[PDB]
Amino acid sequence: STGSATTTPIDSLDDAYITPVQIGTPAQTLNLDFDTGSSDLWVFSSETTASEVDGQTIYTPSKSTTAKLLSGATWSISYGDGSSSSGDVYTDTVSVGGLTVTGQAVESAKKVSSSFTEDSTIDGLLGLAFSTLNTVSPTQQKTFFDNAKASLDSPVFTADLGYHAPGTYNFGFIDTTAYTGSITYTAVSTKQGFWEWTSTGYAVGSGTFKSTSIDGIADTGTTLLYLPATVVSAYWAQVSGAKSSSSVGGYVFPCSATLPSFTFGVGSARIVIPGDYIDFGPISTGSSSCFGGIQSSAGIGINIFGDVALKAAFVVFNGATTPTLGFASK
Numbered sequence: 136s137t138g139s140a141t142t143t144p145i146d147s148l149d150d151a152y153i154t155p156v157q158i159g160t161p162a163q164t165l166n167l168d169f170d171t172g173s174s175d176l177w178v179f180s181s182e183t184t185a186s187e188v189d190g191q192t193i194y195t196p197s198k199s200t201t202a203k204l205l206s207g208a209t210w211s212i213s214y215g216d217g218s219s220s221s222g223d224v225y226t227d228t229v230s231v232g233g234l235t236v237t238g239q240a241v242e243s244a245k246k247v248s249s250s251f252t253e254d255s256t257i258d259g260l261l262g263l264a265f266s267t268l269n270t271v272s273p274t275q276q277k278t279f280f281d282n283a284k285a286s287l288d289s290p291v292f293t294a295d296l297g298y299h300a301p302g303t304y305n306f307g308f309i310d311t312t313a314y315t316g317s318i319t320y321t322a323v324s325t326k327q328g329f330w331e332w333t334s335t336g337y338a339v340g341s342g343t344f345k346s347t348s349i350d351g352i353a354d355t356g357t358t359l360l361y362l363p364a365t366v367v368s369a370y371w372a373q374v375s376g377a378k379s380s381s382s383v384g385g386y387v388f389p390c391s392a393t394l395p396s397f398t399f400g401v402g403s404a405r406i407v408i409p410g411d412y413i414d415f416g417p418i419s420t421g422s423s424s425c426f427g428g429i430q431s432s433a434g435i436g437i438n439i440f441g442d443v444a445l446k447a448a449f450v451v452f453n454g455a456t457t458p459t460l461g462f463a464s465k
């Protein structure tokens with residue numbers, strides 16, 4: 136089998152991407168944030184505290200003839216941005232882009248933190264990291280990808296995120312029309328439950344490439360590119376008037392600037408992030424200070440290749456017995 140679904144930015148800045156997902160019988164379509172940095176499929180629901188729902192579409196398990204309570208199971212998650220959610224668990228039929236999994240764990244939120252409430256466009260998360268990170272207790276549950284894998288034509292999914300435009304998540308096949316040149320594959324460590332890999336280095340604009348190992352994660356659920364402070368300082372030093380602001384919480388730059396590109400290494404290959412991808416717009420409405428898309432990881436404990444980086448590539452998440460990542464230009 137295969138599946139193919141369009142992913143759409145939630146706003147003019149590409150803060151996140153939503154993909155429609157069919158849950159239950161008859162189908163209930165929710166728009167989920169596909170997240171290769173976490174491993175829970177959780178939804179706004181008929182169980183969510185009413186004051187914490189503000190415009191999201193909810194899953195109502197009592198209206199699904201295939202929903203079953205997973206007795207005794209609970210979940211609770213906290214994300215790198217400090218957001219959180221928790222609840223109980225159903226199994227139900229879940230389809231993405233024509234690919235169906237029966238008996239998927241659908242984690243129903245009883246509580247969500249204010250960032251989730253305040254974002255009417257995201258109805259929940261669909262985790263695509265390794266199932267070892269799944270938070271369901273006392274019986275850990277499998278991701279949608281892990282449940283689909285055996286049925287797929289090839290044990291892979293691909294992320295093709297757009298810049299200010301829709302893109303695609305494919306399951307079970309590699310669309311050879313979706314990228315230019317060849318796909319460079321690189322080793323993955325699953326030891327922390329992430330798609331963790333080592334970039335071979337970077338360049339700033341037309342500058343010379345610096346060969347240096349940068350360990351980090353391929354994370355579709357993170358907006359920005361978080362790298363070591365040395366690398367980030369080298370980038371922003373090329374932008375007149377850029378500075379790190381403790382009050383704003385990162386590097387800011389004059390909105391009048393033209394940003395340089397940023398290149399990262401994948402083996403001997405190179406992915407170029409255009410400068411425009413690094414502009415996250417005014418820090419507050421009408422400000423002439425703009426927020427940068429490349430920020431320091433120093434306060435995180437891991438480097439994160441988030442959407443700023445991944446949207447410059449066609450990315451293969453190879454779930455073979457020994458997982459690997461692939462990157463192509465597009």
Ligand SMILES: CCCc1nccc(N)n1
Pocket residue numbers: 150151214216218250251254257358
């Ligand atoms: C705007 C980024 C997407 C998002 N929305 C709500 C909560 C969260 N952690 N991320």
